[PDB]
Amino acid sequence: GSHMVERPPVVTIMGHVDHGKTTLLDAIRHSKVTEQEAGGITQHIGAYQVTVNDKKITFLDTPGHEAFTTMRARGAQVTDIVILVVAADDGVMPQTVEAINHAKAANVPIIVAINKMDKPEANPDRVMQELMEYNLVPEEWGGDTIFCKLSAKTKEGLDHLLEMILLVSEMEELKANP
């Protein structure tokens, strides 16, 4: 809330390249409403700020010291968001872990983005158990991990992705899961 200062909810997109985290920004680039200046993939910029529902979704963080919140602050719990991208049957790659291991310990929710799920389904449950293997129990299961079985290409789950993101800005203001 804004009572304790409305800290900008930086929705950091994490996962790994192959899972299609670029596809997220790319597909979402084809459905922008505000942005900054340039949402093009060039190392001076790239990500942007999306105004859906008019909630300030600032995508991608600025790695000054640590990617996802510099690890030296316990008197300032920032509203960082861990978007955890996945892809069909891959589950969790190295980067998927090192980001979650880094993320989960800030007392922040994490959001699986099952890419390539626009098929019937690779194996959600298996993949989901990989997440809860890092103790990221899905919200289906009652942990703190929002599983979005989406698609950026078909543009089905792209919608459902932001739907879950803002859902976080809703429930985190109250009590989250419990």
User: Which secondary-structure segment (H or E) carries 10?
Assistant: strand 10-14
Q: Where are the domains of the chain?
A: 3-178
Q: In angstroms, rounded to a whole number, what is the distance separating the alpha carbons of residues 113 and 96?
A: 11
Q: What is the DSSP letter of 138?
A: B
Give CA separation, 30 vs 24, 34, 152, in Å.
10, 12, 10
Counting every residue, how long is the chain? 178
Region 3-178: CATH code: 3.40.50.300
Question: Integer distance in angstroms from the first to the last C-alpha of the chain?
Answer: 19
Q: In angstroms, rounded to a whole number, what is the distance separating the alpha carbons of residues 19 and 85?
A: 6
117 is in an annotated binding site: yes
* Residue of 139, 28, 148, 159 lying closest to 87 (CA atoms): 148
Catalytic-labelled residue, pool 3, 44, 65, 102: 65
Q: Which amino acid is at 64?
A: G
Phi-psi region of 165 (alpha: psi -120 to 50; beta: other; left: phi over 0): alpha
168 is in an annotated binding site: no
Q: According to the entry, how was the structure determined?
A: NMR
Tell me whether residue 160 is one of the annotated catalytic residues.
no
157 is in an annotated binding site: no
Q: In angstroms, rounded to a whole number, what is the distance separating the alpha carbons of residues 51 and 116?
A: 25
175 is in an annotated binding site: no
153: its two tokens? 């290409």
Q: In angstroms, rounded to a whole number, what is the distance separating the alpha carbons of residues 24 and 151?
A: 9
In 68-138, alpha helices (H): 94-103, 124-131
* Residue of 111, 92, 121 lying closest to 172 (CA atoms): 111
